[PDB]
Amino acid sequence: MNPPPPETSNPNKPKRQTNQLQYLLRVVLKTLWKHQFAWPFQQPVDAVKLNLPDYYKIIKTPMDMGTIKKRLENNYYWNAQECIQDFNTMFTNCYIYNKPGDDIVLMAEALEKLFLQKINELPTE
Numbered sequence: 001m002n003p004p005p006p007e008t009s010n011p012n013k014p015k016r017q018t019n020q021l022q023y024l025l026r027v028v029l030k031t032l033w034k035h036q037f038a039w040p041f042q043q044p045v046d047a048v049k050l051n052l053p054d055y056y057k058i059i060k061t062p063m064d065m066g067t068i069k070k071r072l073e074n075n076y077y078w079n080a081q082e083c084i085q086d087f088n089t090m091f092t093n094c095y096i097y098n099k100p101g102d103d104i105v106l107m108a109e110a111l112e113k114l115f116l117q118k119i120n121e122l123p124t125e
């Protein structure tokens with residue numbers, strides 16, 4: 001069974017639109033989204049479809065780029081660091097559940113190195 005996906009809206013969470021958060025959506029996420037290795041990360045892990053029954057036994061804080069994309073579009077974040085943390089959680093989950101050398105890890109590594117190149121310089125507020 002899959003758990004409920006992470007929330008993409010929360011009316012009592014404080015929000016704001018910063019230049020950096022707009023950059024994370026327009027530049028950083030759109031670039032990673034078009035990558036050849038992006039498809040496994042574009043939606044929450046379906047433990048039933050992918051035949052990964054132990055996934056949510058191991059991963060207690062799931063995250064994916066589809067959730068991040070909706071969070072950015074719905075103005076869910078307070079600052080860019082909250083969004084960067086969601087990216088880091090998505091990558092760390094992949095390295096926790098899988099092992100070095102796996103195809104999915106090679107994909108995550110390629111996206112993480114691209115992610116670091118794009119956020120090395122953010123716009124100023």
Ligand SMILES: CCn1c(=O)cc(SCC(=O)N2CC[NH+](C3CCCCC3)CC2)c2ccccc21
Pocket residue numbers: 040041045050051052053054093094097098104
């Ligand atoms: C980034 C999320 N994610 C994964 O972490 C792993 C995978 S594939 C992991 C995989 O193929 N495994 C990992 C689990 N493994 C066994 C599954 C049965 C329990 C014992 C472990 C079977 C082979 C993945 C695939 C599609 C989309 C997302 C995926």
Ligand code: NA
Pocket residue numbers: 095096097098099100
């Ligand atoms: Na691991």
Ligand code: NA
Pocket residue numbers: 117118119120121122
């Ligand atoms: Na940049």
